[PDB]
Symmetry: none
Subunit: 104 residues, 2 copies
Amino acid sequence: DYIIKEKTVLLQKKDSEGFGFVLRGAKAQTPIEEFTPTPAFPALQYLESVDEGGVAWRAGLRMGDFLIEVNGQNVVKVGHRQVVNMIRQGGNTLMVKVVMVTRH
Amino acid sequence: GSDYIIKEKTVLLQKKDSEGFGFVLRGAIEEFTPTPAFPALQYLESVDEGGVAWRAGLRMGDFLIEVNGQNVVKVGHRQVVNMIRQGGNTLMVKVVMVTRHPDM
Ligand SMILES: [Br-]
Ligand SMILES: [Br-]
Ligand SMILES: [Br-]
Ligand SMILES: [Br-]
Ligand SMILES: [Br-]
């Protein structure tokens, strides 16, 4: 039985800083296939690391958070490259909907 | 934000010819993406108590993920219905029950 805790947070940063988090893939997907979300892995991208005291950190984001939406756009099946580009477009403002999965 | 309790269930239904599986399938634009809140396009609108589906553990609100091994998360209504009637009196379905608990 899974418990998925969801929330939408707003990240606001300065021009000379980053959002303070690193994104990686959930599993070792094969490039010849689309990602299939499951309760344990609801999104292709997840936060692999968050700098303590950084923008993402202060907003409540933590390692383990799965990325569901970027600036109102669903990115559950979207790759790293596109997500980075999407985040760039937003400049110093980034809205993300994330989920933390628990209880196995 | 909200908490989403997720319970996945895979059952095997077997019915007589003088009966149906005992459920009303409803289809949730035809290009959607699964999210923890809404994991699939088709879901059980109704399930007859004491029916084949009911006795197997299926309940109103369950989202259809697979029909006879085939992922139907993003498949249309007519197509899924055909897949179900294909197996005849036998239907193996994987579903996910989602209950939302809003934050306050
Ligand atoms: Br899918
Ligand atoms: Br791109
Ligand atoms: Br790309
Ligand atoms: Br969600
Ligand atoms: Br549909």
